[PDB]
Amino acid sequence: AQTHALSNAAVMDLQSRWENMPSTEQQDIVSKLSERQKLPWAQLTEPEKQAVWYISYGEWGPRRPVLNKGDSSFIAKGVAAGLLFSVGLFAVVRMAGGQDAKTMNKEWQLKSDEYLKSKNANPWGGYSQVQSK
Amino acid sequence: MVQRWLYSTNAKDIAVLYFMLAIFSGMAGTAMSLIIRLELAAPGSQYLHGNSQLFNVLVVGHAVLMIFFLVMPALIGGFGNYLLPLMIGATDTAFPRINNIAFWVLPMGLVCLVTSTLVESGAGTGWTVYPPLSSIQAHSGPSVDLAIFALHLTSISSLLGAINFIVTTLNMRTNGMTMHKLPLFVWSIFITAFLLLLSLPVLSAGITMLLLDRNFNTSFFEVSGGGDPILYEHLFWFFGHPEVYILIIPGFGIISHVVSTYSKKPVFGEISMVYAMASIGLLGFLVWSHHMYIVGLDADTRAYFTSATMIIAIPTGIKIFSWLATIHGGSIRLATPMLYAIAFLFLFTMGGLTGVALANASLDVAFHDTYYVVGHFHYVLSMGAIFSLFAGYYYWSPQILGLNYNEKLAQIQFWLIFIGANVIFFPMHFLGINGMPRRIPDYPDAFAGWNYVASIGSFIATLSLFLFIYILYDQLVNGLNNKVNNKSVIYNKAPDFVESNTIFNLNTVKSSSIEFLLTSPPAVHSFNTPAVQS
Amino acid sequence: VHFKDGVYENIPFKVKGRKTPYALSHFGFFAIGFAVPFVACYVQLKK
Amino acid sequence: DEETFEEFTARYEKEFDEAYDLFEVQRVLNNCFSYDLVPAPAVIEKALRAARRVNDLPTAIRVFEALKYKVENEDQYKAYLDELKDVRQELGVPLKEELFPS
Amino acid sequence: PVVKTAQNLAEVNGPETLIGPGAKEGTVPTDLDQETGLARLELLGKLEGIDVFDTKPLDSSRKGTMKDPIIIESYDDYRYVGCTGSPAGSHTIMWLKPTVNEVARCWECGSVYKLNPVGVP
Amino acid sequence: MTHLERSRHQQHPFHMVMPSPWPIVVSFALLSLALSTALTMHGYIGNMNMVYLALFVLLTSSILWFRDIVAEATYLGDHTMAVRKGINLGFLMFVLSEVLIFAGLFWAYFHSAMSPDVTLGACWPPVGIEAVQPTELPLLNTIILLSSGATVTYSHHALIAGNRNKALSGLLITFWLIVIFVTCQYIEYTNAAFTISDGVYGSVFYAGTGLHFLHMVMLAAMLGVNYWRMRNYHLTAGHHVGYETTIIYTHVLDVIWLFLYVVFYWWGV
Amino acid sequence: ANKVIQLQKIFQSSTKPLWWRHPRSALYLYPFYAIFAVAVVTPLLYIPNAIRGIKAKKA
Amino acid sequence: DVPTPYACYFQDSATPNQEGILELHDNIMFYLLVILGLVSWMLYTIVMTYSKNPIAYKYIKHGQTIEVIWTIFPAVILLIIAFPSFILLYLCDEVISPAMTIKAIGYQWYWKYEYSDFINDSGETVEFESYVIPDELLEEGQLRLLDTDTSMVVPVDTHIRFVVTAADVIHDFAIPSLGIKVDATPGRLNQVSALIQREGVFYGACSELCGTGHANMPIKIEAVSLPKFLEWLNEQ
Amino acid sequence: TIAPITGTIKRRVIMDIVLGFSLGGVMASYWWWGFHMDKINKREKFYAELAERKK
């Protein structure tokens, strides 16, 4: 089966180099670990247990999540930059476009409020249309 | 490549061609929507120097484009002809030359539609092509003629697609697929093909009647001659509400097929789901009088039709609650198709509640042709078409094309179109609830604030579309690098909780249909051996 | 008739094999789609 | 059709004795935990015995990890843990809580 | 000289022997005479009882363990096979792709399918 | 059979049709027809020549399409049992679509005429209707359509019986008989009693009868090509599909003409 | 005539496209394609005169 | 009466029709907000719980009792919202013994009203059109696209039956303040009763497509008291 | 020894449904008893003052 132990240069701290290792060393280390597996499990060293757990149920390869550890920041900054860029582009085509109506004024709105006040329209709700500056 | 594509017969190439025409015409439809919101942004005709005829032309152009040339040839056309042969394990669809003529008669509809806009005057009538507005007196010039021919060519294409689909799924089920064991999207395409077959003849009849009145001096709807436009209103909405339920049915199918595989549990009661689809399909017919409660229908007629169009909210509610059961008790791997299905669920629920508030004939007297009907239908139609379309694209695109979209770009595309769609079609509920009429290029000088924030929301959604077509280029030229490096999501269904990694590596794809087991981009005529099922 | 399937031959345009860069065509297609209504409004305001 | 807890226990006892390769152990473990109940101490003891007879440690740690994520209260989790004490000390399966110090 | 006309089932060697003779000049063409190609082959199989294009569903009587794999006949190197469980209706329908070189496993009912090929290229 | 031979065939009954140009050619013909008639009916095309050219090229392209599917049916021979059932079901759904077109016209006429402005005096309404004596010109037409259906199923039972000299003569009888019916409808429309602007009743009557005329010339083309395929021995005793779609089309057009006849000349008067 | 058997042997003893095979069809096919080219190239030429407003003369 | 900017409701009611449909609409919106809060809470807690539930419960698919609950709860809530909708719809439809009508015909991009019961010179009824004010003919105080040259005058508190008909093209006589929106086809007329309850100016527009002259088509209804109404009718 | 822990998704689903109904009731009661009641009170106050000016 196997010798007395497995070296901590290969079996300890697998969790930052397993995805970088070549496939030959991957198959070799998992083969030596499965050869260790046949012993009663009170005799395996703790880096071997940590390594075989990182092989089976680790967050590498298939079990990688959808947003790898920094992507909520990227999507928030992207959505914020996109919304501010959309508001900026709409303001640019607002300034470079057609001229506005001659009745979104201040005094015209005030005198239309005077006309609606004299005609007493919208008694309990809001009749005031200033809504512009 | 003319032999592969122009003379084409196989289902996959025709479906890809359907999808490309769908993206092209949907781009044109959203540009028409952009100019609609641009002239609508400020009170007064700012951009279009007057010329309200151009505003009505762009309303009917946007309407006809994004119903008949984006959502129909997308959902029925592309995803239909790609998955309905494949999810049943058929080799290719039966009647394949009919399917090829269906697709290739669509862009002739597109050419005569853009010629209807380009030609002398312009069809200024709206997608409801109501006479006497579409008579020769209120509309000279062949523009209404060419747009009506576009509607006829799209009717021919959707009818041929529906009859091809119903025979292909009624005869070429593979070696175990009894009708109780059909996939859910297949049942949706079957139901909408049945509805298209039982609806589109009446549309072709009514539009031919309008053409006979318009060019051949007949009297069907013109009053000088005894006719009435109430007959066109009856025929066009007897088409039209089955048309929009036809737009919404494969959306339900694609959303169910996303949810039941990203929540890792089967759909709650597939028999109840397909009976709900059959019920909403058959009840889309008998509520066709809800579009003209204003017109002068009697007391018993309106009180029957409001009860029917409010009892149609029972099967849709069965579908929504079954979907919520399907997401409950799963493992919601929040990728982009699941995000699109979640926001489809919420937004379609909000739009359906707006519709059921609209449905009452005692309440339709203050909402018809306001912007409240615009809120309900742009919500339900835009969400349950565009969100379902994006869910289907991000759900099947590595399978049907064999490349990989960037993931973070897909999620920001979803968030941009969600916040844009919400902020554009929530104010139209208020603008309709305080009486802003439909189809106005210039408006009362009080509505400027909401009709300004709506034009902000249109710019947000168009930015989401430009991000989407950047994602398309990135998927098409970096799909292999996205497969290799950690950008995309390679394995769609995650490993389950006690499942190892080597076991998952030997059993990578756990689907409930065939096509996810098919190879990246699949072999040209697969199923050399017929695919057997227990 | 047998069609040579691969990873890029399921779409009717040559993506990698080309003599020009591809993004010009890939955005010119969507830009023609996006610019058809602008040409329509330009013609209608010309008339 | 419906089933009570005892017939469930008998079914997964027979299934956990009949699993042979590593794939069948993890398959019957997944179908043993995907229910509206956490399996019995007898089924978890048979799960550990079938994990030892298959010569694979980490599934016999994911058993306890899935038991923790399946139980509803950590008091009940310790009630399972102190009741499965002899089989865990016998096979020598380190718990995931005491494997990674953080 | 001329290739034959395949009077029976075990005689046809190629598509060229699916021709048949013709009706004389009077009575109508009988189906055995004028039908050609795959229709003629299907007609021969309809005559002698050999149902061509087997629509027989997947045998789901037993489980199909690893030591006794369910062997399925294919004419290509892969065959998409949908399983439901130990009865015909146990679990939700799940598709497996057994190939030539490896078996396919269920993950639900534990079935192991092995593709034996017909092949002979 | 042996496995080596069994691998050398299509392995599944459905038709794997070769690529063909008639989709895009029929589509461009349809585009040219719609664009040309929309230009011509608004005074942009003076001499009506392009509409006739596009109509002819669409007819020739559909004829070439039907020659290709007939050659694939009886010469290449990939028409199995399953494809026979499929093309039968497809034609049945197409006939349902055309029946629905005529039912849409019927419901239009019903909502026009069963609910007009009420009279309040004498009932049995019609005041304003098409002219007198619309009868006996359909009392020859209905009885020749009944005779058409009778001799069509007569020749069909002759064809399954195998006696060719009966079935060809019955086919020639029904072909010449319904084209005599088509010419009789044409001369009835030329020797008419009113025109299309005489109310909604006369307008929908002329529209329905023109669509029925077009479906009858399509039935005449189907009977002509079934006769040309019987004369050159394409039809068999058991594998006939063109005769089955032709007999079901003839019976459906028979019942639609009976419906139009009774509701326009007996009950709706 | 009864040319079904001979036509089956011809239609399966060919390499040409399916609509080209039996030897009467070339005289069918060439004055179809030329007429189709005319009927699809001419109405596209009548669109700029339509959008220019130039109607049909002498009517 | 006049649409408020940044509005979030209906306008101020002036008739039993508008307050009836307002009370009906809020009775509808109560149960619809119940359902929307239900679906939003269910969706939010479902994603925020089961996005991190790694053991997928894939053995739950029958649920017959929850299926009949989903069948029977929309039916009873639809009967609940169908009862007062039917009551108010059969309430507001009958023209319950009026005393005055006025024809409001709609010609192509301008309204024309005929007072159907009052004379002008000698056996001749009174009629006038209501053209929209062109924007170069405005004045500081008057509004764009809702003011007309001839403001239609209606007497307060008598059941008035508006009969509308089109002339050339389908229009829509639409005042949301008086709660009426009634289409006009050139074939047949359409009548609807109302009763204004306060003196006020209520605006409207043709709420149907009308060609290019569709926005600029206002309906200016001024409900004035009956001495002032008779004074305006004599001076008209 | 240990009670068989059965039916956690049943209790969780029924409490989630009753919490959804309680939240919908809170939101809709807020909507009704704020908005509809203030609008009705304002309208009846204005009609009461118009009737008092008429009397």
Ligand code: HEA
């Ligand atoms: C599915 C159809 C659809 C969709 C999505 C939309 C979406 C939009 N529509 Fe509209 N619209 C109609 C169909 C549609 N519309 C119809 C039928 C009418 C009736 C005409 C009438 O009432 O007379 C109408 C009317 C209508 C009005 C009512 C005004 C009036 O009374 O005239 C307005 C105003 O805002 C408008 C503009 C917009 C805008 C700014 C959007 C924005 O949402 C646009 C932004 C959308 C996107 C960014 C979607 C993403 C784009 C894609 C191309 C998807 C790609 C998908 C794949 C590749 C799979 N259209």
Ligand code: HEA
């Ligand atoms: C996308 C297609 C689509 C769908 C699915 C719907 C769905 C519904 N629609 Fe709509 N509608 C349109 C497209 C659609 N509609 C279009 C295009 C127009 C305008 C036509 C034009 O002018 O161009 C229109 C306009 C329209 C009218 C005509 C008004 C008018 O034009 O003036 C009516 C009236 O009945 C209506 C109501 C409804 C109702 C009650 C539903 C129901 O089916 C919705 C049911 C869903 C829910 C109710 C929410 C989900 C259910 C639950 C969460 C269960 C709990 C809820 C309850 C118990 C109520 N909508």
Ligand SMILES: CCCCCCCCCCCCCCCC(=O)OC[C@H](COP(=O)(O)OCCN)OC(=O)CCCCCCCCCCCCCCC
């Ligand atoms: C003139 C003689 C006859 C033609 C012979 C061709 C001449 C040979 C040399 C040129 C070869 C042409 C190809 C390369 C050059 C070229 O870019 O071409 C232009 C091609 C010609 O396409 P096509 O003609 O194949 O017809 C095809 C008819 N549509 O338009 C294009 O697609 C432009 C490219 C658009 C890119 C869109 C990207 C979005 C795709 C989304 C896919 C979604 C996945 C599916 C999901 C369901």
Ligand code: CUA
């Ligand atoms: Cu009059 Cu719109």
Ligand SMILES: [Cu+2]
């Ligand atoms: Cu509808």
Ligand SMILES: [Mg+2]
């Ligand atoms: Mg309307």
Ligand SMILES: [Zn+2]
């Ligand atoms: Zn299985």
